[PDB]
Structure formats: C-alpha cells, structure tokens
Short mmCIF file of C-alpha atoms and ligand atoms in Angstrom, two decimals:
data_model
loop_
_atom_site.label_atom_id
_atom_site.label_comp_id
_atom_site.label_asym_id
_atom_site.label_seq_id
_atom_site.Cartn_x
_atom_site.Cartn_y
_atom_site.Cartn_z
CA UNK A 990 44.67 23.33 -11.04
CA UNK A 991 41.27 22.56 -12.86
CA UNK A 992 38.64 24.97 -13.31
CA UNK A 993 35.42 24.90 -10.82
CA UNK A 994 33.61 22.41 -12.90
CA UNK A 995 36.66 20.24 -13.67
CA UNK A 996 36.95 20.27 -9.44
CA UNK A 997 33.73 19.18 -8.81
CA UNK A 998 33.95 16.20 -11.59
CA UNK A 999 37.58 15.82 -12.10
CA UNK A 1000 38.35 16.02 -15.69
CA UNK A 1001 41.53 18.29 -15.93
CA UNK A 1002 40.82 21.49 -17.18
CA UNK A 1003 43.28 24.29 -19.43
CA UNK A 1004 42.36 27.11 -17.56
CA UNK A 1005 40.80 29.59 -20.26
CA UNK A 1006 37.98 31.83 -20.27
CA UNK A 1007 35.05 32.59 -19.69
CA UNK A 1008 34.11 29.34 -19.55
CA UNK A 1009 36.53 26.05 -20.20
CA UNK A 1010 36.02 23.76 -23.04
CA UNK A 1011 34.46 21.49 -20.85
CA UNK A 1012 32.15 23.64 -19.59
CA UNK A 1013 30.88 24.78 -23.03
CA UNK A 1014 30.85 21.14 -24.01
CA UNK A 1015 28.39 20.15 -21.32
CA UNK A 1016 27.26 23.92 -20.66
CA UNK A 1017 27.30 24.31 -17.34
CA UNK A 1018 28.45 27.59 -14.73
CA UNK A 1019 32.59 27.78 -15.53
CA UNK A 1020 33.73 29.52 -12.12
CA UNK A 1021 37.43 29.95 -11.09
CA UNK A 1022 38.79 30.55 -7.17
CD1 CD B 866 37.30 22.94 -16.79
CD1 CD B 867 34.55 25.28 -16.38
#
C-alpha cells in the first residue's frame, strides 16, 4: 500500500524509510500503519 502521506493524497508511494521520497520532496510527517 502507500505510505500515510501517499493515503491521504494518493500518489503511490515505495515504502522506505523514515520518510518516503514524497514526503521529503514536499516535507511533510511520513507515518506508516
Ligand atoms: Cd509516500
Ligand atoms: Cd510519507
């Protein structure tokens, strides 16, 4: 599945920590569940 952030907006996700490259692109909390 995506990662937290890639849930709430949808844009896939590869799974890798801490924090997904689109999280670290657009800096924002990367949180897994
Ligand atoms: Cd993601
Ligand atoms: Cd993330």
């Amino acid at each position: 599945q995506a990662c937290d952030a890639c849930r709430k907006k949808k844009w896939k996700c590869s799974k890798t920590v801490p924090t997904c490259t689109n999280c670290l692109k657009y800096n924002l909390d990367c949180v897994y569940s």
